[PDB]
Subunit: 232 residues, 3 copies
Amino acid sequence: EGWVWGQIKAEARRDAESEPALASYLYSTILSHSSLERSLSFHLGNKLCSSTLLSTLLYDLFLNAFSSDPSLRSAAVADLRAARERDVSYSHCLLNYKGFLACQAHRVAHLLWRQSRRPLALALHSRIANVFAVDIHPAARIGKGILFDHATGVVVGETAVIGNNVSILHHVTLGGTGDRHPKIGDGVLIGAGATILGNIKIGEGAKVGAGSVVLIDVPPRTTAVGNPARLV
Amino acid sequence: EGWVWGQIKAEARRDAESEPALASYLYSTILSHSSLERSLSFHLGNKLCSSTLLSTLLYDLFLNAFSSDPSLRSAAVADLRAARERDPACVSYSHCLLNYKGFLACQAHRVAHLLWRQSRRPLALALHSRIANVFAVDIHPAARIGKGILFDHATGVVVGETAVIGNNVSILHHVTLGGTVGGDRHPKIGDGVLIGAGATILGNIKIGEGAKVGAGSVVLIDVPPRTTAVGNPARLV
Amino acid sequence: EGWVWGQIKAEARRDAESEPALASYLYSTILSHSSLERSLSFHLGNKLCSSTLLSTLLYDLFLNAFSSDPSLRSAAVADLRAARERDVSYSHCLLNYKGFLACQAHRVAHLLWRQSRRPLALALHSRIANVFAVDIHPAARIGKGILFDHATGVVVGETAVIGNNVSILHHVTLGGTGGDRHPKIGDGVLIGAGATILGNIKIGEGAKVGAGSVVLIDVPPRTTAVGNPARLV
Ligand SMILES: CC(C)(COP(=O)(O)OP(=O)(O)OC[C@H]1O[C@@H](n2cnc3c(N)ncnc32)[C@H](O)[C@@H]1OP(=O)(O)O)[C@@H](O)C(=O)NCCC(=O)NCCS
Ligand SMILES: CC(C)(COP(=O)(O)OP(=O)(O)OC[C@H]1O[C@@H](n2cnc3c(N)ncnc32)[C@H](O)[C@@H]1OP(=O)(O)O)[C@@H](O)C(=O)NCCC(=O)NCCS
Ligand SMILES: CC(C)(COP(=O)(O)OP(=O)(O)OC[C@H]1O[C@@H](n2cnc3c(N)ncnc32)[C@H](O)[C@@H]1OP(=O)(O)O)[C@@H](O)C(=O)NCCC(=O)NCCS
């Protein structure tokens, strides 16, 4: 993290000196701080704010969360390495990637939902669907190192589980058909416009083709595709 | 309705004491009010506003609509009950009212549909655009929807100018009821129909009563009532 | 153009008198201007502004682009004719059509991407994805006479090429599967709603890709691809 943070500063410092119309915002958002945690809260606050919710209130809200849970910072960094490897600049991904931003703002919403602040967690969950166009129910359990390519259009149900190092592309739907939502193994690649329905199990290292409609379980390391989807 | 309105005010009261940050907003929107019609209008006007349209201008507009049409109030309650009785995530009445893109969009549409029949079409499209921006629901003002409609995860939905949606229909996210130029060219949905996520239904075809259309399906033919349509291209089951 | 603008000013002066809820906004946007570029620049600036980017700044940016490049003004009028022909009243298409407004904002980002103002280009690119719900990489080459119908949900890759007179619909994905790796769409093609096209494959002139289709192979001119996976018809 400490080095990753060192990158973003240098990388945001270049974009500042070369593009003056983004200089101010880059300073306040990134260059004026001394920690990724503070710089990520400052951003998420300004992005998710509304009449109902001040920007300052949310800056405070995400800052406490990040400073109260070490796993979150461990995730935010892991989700940032996942992009720079799998996908951009480190700083662009910080300030421009809806998939990254929303994943992080979800963990806070997940936290709030565990700490019995459900009315606020659903409110924050509503902003996320409005701004980042990502629709993950707060109760959903997601891992770290998650990549959301062009996250516009994503829907994750209430009782779904997303393992680590999963790549979920645009327009993916993990929904029902109780515990009625899919469980995604570590290192799964889900294709664009894919819909996976019902409490089923996608195996580790598996891959799901674009436009697929998976109803049945998908064994690890296997590739499933089609409408309906069968094992290749 | 007075029960639903009474249930909303109660749940809102519980949330205002459990979370201070949402207190003031819940008061002004729900608690400080005496009816559902006024609380809905107050809320729509705040989510569908811009520099083009003031929040206060819209407040009056929806408020004049609901007060000049009993059917509009009936549709909102019927829609409220249908998210409590039907929705997977099992929402309380207040959370559907405030946080649900679908239900909220549907009530903004009914007014837009009203400004179209009342020959205020340049306004009916201005308000149609806002609904698309904010709620991510693209229904033409000339489209006919019933009441008791469900809209899970609203974002993505598109409904055509000539389409017809009956009562108690469940439309899921990313569904398209669109064409295949002039005339009846969009689908007619019967009552009780469930339309799966992502599914696209094209043309002046009729999805009969109680039928079901699975996710990611591409329906191009008529679907006989009380049956199930599925696949690309969709087949009857 | 000199007429299509004359027709916009006509339709706009009409709605301005038939709905005073929009009267000041129409005057400010359209009727107080003497060019299509200025009104388009004005509008696109208010539609895309945020805390990062002032509306009066983006109004300066769009104005200086259309004024520097005559092929922008043409591509705008082309896109306008296309929607009027294929889909609006001209005024309505100018002010409320997400697909149109996206295109004309994208080309400006594309210019910045060539003129090496790539941080600004991607900034402007990221607003266009918010406001207009169209995700086109500034690197993507698009022609003119382009129609995005209910433009929500469109994703266009970095090495995609979209030819003249193409109709791209609801929920289309022109994506991948470094280097050239995205679709190349010929002139006159109609892409269906929900369709996903993947790879450095070519869609020939005047072809047709059905709705919800998944395209992985090339598609020969003047033929129709359909289904999942897509078969020629
Ligand atoms: C399926 C995928 C994951 C590749 O995995 P894979 O193991 O290499 O799959 P294969 O290349 O072996 O597929 C070969 C067979 O599966 C079929 N197939 C492959 N991808 C398919 C798809 N997306 N939809 C339907 N069928 C598909 C092929 O038609 C072929 O069928 P065949 O056996 O009858 O000849 C990949 O092709 C894909 O779908 N990626 C989506 C990524 C995306 O959408 N990116 C958008 C970026 S903007
Ligand atoms: C289609 C649906 C309505 C089921 O209706 P149904 O009458 O019970 O049909 P069944 O579940 O009994 O399955 C019947 C057949 O159709 C097939 N089938 C069902 N749903 C399918 C789908 N979405 N795609 C492709 N094939 C499907 C089944 O494989 C089965 O095949 P078979 O004849 O070889 O056995 C349901 O599967 C569905 O798709 N719901 C939408 C899910 C959704 O949108 N969730 C989001 C909530 S967050
Ligand atoms: C493919 C399309 C362009 C029609 O073009 P076309 O050249 O006339 O193709 P046809 O109508 O002759 O199709 C006939 C056959 O292709 C099949 N077919 C056509 N369109 C299909 C589609 N979108 N999906 C699956 N199958 C399709 C038909 O079932 C039919 O089957 P058959 O081979 O057994 O006879 C049209 O169907 C389409 O996909 N339009 C999308 C536009 C849209 O989605 N608009 C939304 C507006 S809001």
